[PDB]
Structure formats: structure tokens, C-alpha cells
Amino acid sequence: MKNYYSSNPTFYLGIDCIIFGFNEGEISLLLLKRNFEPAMGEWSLMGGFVQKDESVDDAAKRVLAELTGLENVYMEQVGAFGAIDRDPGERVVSIAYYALININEYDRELVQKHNAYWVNINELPALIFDHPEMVDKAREMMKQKASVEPIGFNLLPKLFTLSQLQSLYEAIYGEPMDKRNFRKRVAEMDFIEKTDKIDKRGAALYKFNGKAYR
Amino acid sequence: NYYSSNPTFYLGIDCIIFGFNEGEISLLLLKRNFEPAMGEWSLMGGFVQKDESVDDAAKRVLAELTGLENVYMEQVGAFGAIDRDPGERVVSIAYYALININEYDRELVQKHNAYWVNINELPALIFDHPEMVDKAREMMKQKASVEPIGFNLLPKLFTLSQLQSLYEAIYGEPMDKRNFRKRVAEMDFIEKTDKIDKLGSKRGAALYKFNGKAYRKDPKFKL
Ligand SMILES: O[C@@H]1[C@@H](O)[C@@H](O)CO[C@H]1O
Ligand SMILES: O[C@@H]1[C@@H](O)[C@@H](O)CO[C@H]1O
């Protein structure tokens, strides 16, 4: 059995989940009031710790489910945050994970039962520790992702107008966009495709495809 | 004692140092100096210590195992599969860089028994090191697409062929010369100087430089 590596120290390994939600033209962040010390009661990302019996990726899934009830949310790793004094309680290196989801009814009731709250990304309260830095990094990742592949397949209807698409991009990027230049930029995205169908007024309908994955 | 209902983990460090030299990319490798898997081909592997940030751990590990200092690395990810390290549960945070080989002390590296291996002729690496390398390589490609790159990998006055060679090595593919120079035209961070190449491979070729102001990374990503 003994002890490979026992000369080295061990560390608490944190998990923080960053859940962006799109609804009615706005992005919100899912937040809670932290249920343990230090900084108990203060505004927080969904925070937990990696356990011995699980991968770090599965820790994220578990932490999310424990603190919000949400299951079946695919998340992408944001990074390992390991500044010495990031957590005032102990040395904690935290691994952040993020997703962008479409905010829907059953999920809404579930989240509310956990005392998690959707807060508009332009009106965030002061978050504990380095959570604002984590959120900023996830938001930049989301921006970059949206420029190279479909940002999600159930954020918008299967067939969507350019106006609907523009509202999603403006929310992600956090600034209004020029309609003509946005249309030109979309024409350069081979993963968005104009169909023959029209909205029912007369606006052209577009769809995401799988061309960014080839 | 906060958080004591939770366990603690060994936190690995792995450094993935790609080197650019004579139009090709290499990986800096070593023979692992501790067990298990002692003597086998490995990345610069260590562990985070109590004294240091994880970023600073990656610096110390790099300097201990190669002598290289002042090398900026970007985080690849935390690799946390339960069985990735057969010795023990270790969550390893991999870091990467693409450096200019000639710009560093090649004898200092040699002294540390670290070897540049060509990126297309890698030996079998230990544990999940090939996965880490693959991930770093994909990030290098993604950056090269969306950002200005290679200020310290090219001479201050460089040709379009030299710039092309960098991109070709990064993506690992020959490129169309026609379309590349068209893409180079849309890059506002590369400016054409008055000067010309009197020593290199295409004599009299236009020498370009990076415009520092335009090279600078945007604080927020632009569509
Ligand atoms: O980021 C914190 C981490 O440092 C630990 O306190 C667990 O909760 C997370 O939200
Ligand atoms: O990836 C390994 C890590 O798991 C630990 O063994 C330290 O060295 C690294 O190379």
C-alpha cells in the first residue's frame, strides 16, 4: 500500500459551477447564499468540494445537483483557480465549470426549492472570494465559443430569425450590435444556415448545423 | 478547521513546452525521475507545494526540471479522472507554452537532461500525458485562429514565408500561399516596413513587423 508522493502536501479541491441562463433576451447567472462558513450567507456560485469516489468532472455534476436540483447539464471546465489566499478558510484550489442553459418551467420550480436565484448578469451583487474572476473567465469563453460553433441547440427554436439570433449574441457579448454588420458576420459563420422558410412577419428563418464539428 | 468533512488531494503539475525552431515544432521531454514509472518518457511533472500558487508551482517545476525561467505558460486544464495516476489519486493541472528554442540557454536545458523531440515523432508518454499534449495542441490552434501570435517566435523584422512557417507548424499542415497572404491582409497587427531582406531565403522580400498597439490582446473578446 505504502505511500508514493507522501513527501508532498495535499489540498482541498473546490468546485464552482457557473450557470448562465438565457430567457426573453437576457442572460442571468444562477446564484445562492452560501450555506457554510466562512462567508456563510453571502452571495456565491454553486460551491462544493471534490470527493474521493468521483472524477473532478463528476464532482461538478454532483455539486450542481446538490445545490440547485439541476441534472443533465453539460458543463465545460473554466479552470483551476489556485492563488494562495483565494479562500480565506483554508488553502482551496477550486475548479470552475460553466454552462449556458435555456431557463424552463420544471427546472425553475426545482431551482426555487433549493433557494438558488437567477440574477441578471448586468445587476450582479458582490460575490465572495474570486467568484467574479471565475464568472468573467467563463463569460469570455462563452463569447469565444459563440464565434466558432453553435452556442447551444435549445437556446432558440430549431428555426430562428436573425433578430432572435442577434438578441442571443447581444446578451452574450453584453453590448448592442449593428444589424447590418451582424448579418455580415453571420454570413461568415458556416455553422448557421439560411433556410427557404419564413416566419409567420416574412422574416427569413435560419438554423444551426453540424459544420463546425467537421 | 473549516471544510474538514471533505478530503484532500495530491495536486500534480505538468508542463507542456512546445518549441519553435527552423520552421518546426518540438516538445520538451524528460525521463521521469521518481516512481512509479521511473525512467519513462514524461512531461515536466511535479506537485504543488504549500508555499505557492498553482501558477507559481508550474514555474518552479519548469525551472527545477529544465532550468528555463521567465517562460509564460497558460493553463490547459485540471485532469481529474480517478485512475489517471497509477501511484495514487492525483489531480494534475497541466500548463503549456510555445517558445522560441534559440531564445533560451540550450546548454542549461541539456544539463537538466531534458530533450527536444519532434512533435510528429513523440515516444509513448506516461499516464494521460498524451491526452494533455493533444489538448494543449488544440488550444494552440484555437488561439492562432482568433488572436495575434508569435511576437517572440519570429525576428523583429520577418518575412511572410517565416510567418507562414509558424502557422503551418502550429496547425501541422501545409497552407495555400494565395489565401494566407489574403488572410495576412485582413490582419491589422502586421505592418509592412520600408526595409527588405538582403540575407534570407527570398532576397529583397518585404520585411514585416508586429504593430505592438494592434498586436495587444483585447481585454474582452470581439465578435
Ligand atoms: O470557491 C469556493 C471554494 O474555495 C470552497 O470554499 C467551496 O465553495 C466554493 O464556492
Ligand atoms: O502527471 C503526473 C502526476 O500525476 C504526478 O505523478 C506528478 O508527475 C506528473 O507527471
Residue numbers in the entry:
A (entry chain A): 1 to 200, 205 to 218
B (entry chain B): 3 to 225
Text taken from the publication that reported this structure:
In this study we identified and characterized a novel L-arabinose-responsive transcription factor found in the Bacteroides species, which belongs to the NrtR family of Nudix-related transcriptional regulators. The NrtR family transcription factors are characterized by an N-terminal Nudix hydrolase-like effector-binding domain and a C-terminal DNA-binding domain. In this work, genome-scale regulon inference using the comparative genomics approach revealed that the NrtR family AraR regulators in Bacteroides and Prevotella spp. control not only the L-arabinose catabolic operons, but also several other gene loci involved in the utilization of arabinose-containing polysaccharides. The predicted AraR-regulated operons are involved in the uptake and catabolism of L-arabinose and the decomposition of arabinose-containing polysaccharides (e.g., arabinan, arabinoxylan, pectic galactan) to oligosaccharides, their translocation into the periplasm, and further hydrolysis.
We determined the structures of full-length apo–BtAraR protein, its complex with a specific DNA duplex, and its complex with the L-arabinose effector. The solved structures provide a first view of the structural mechanism underlying the regulatory function of the L-arabinose-binding Nudix domain. The comparison of the DNA- and L-arabinose-bound forms shows how L-arabinose binding reduces BtAraR affinity for its specific DNA operator sequence. The movement of several secondary structure elements upon effector binding leads to domain rotation and causes major changes in the dimer conformation. These changes affect the orientation of the wHTH domains, leading to disruption of the protein–DNA interaction. Conservation of the AraR residues involved in the interaction with L-arabinose and with the specific DNA sequences, as well as the conservation of DNA-binding motifs of AraR in other species, together suggest that all orthologs of AraR identified in the Bacteroides and Prevotella species retain their molecular function and specificity toward effector and DNA molecules.
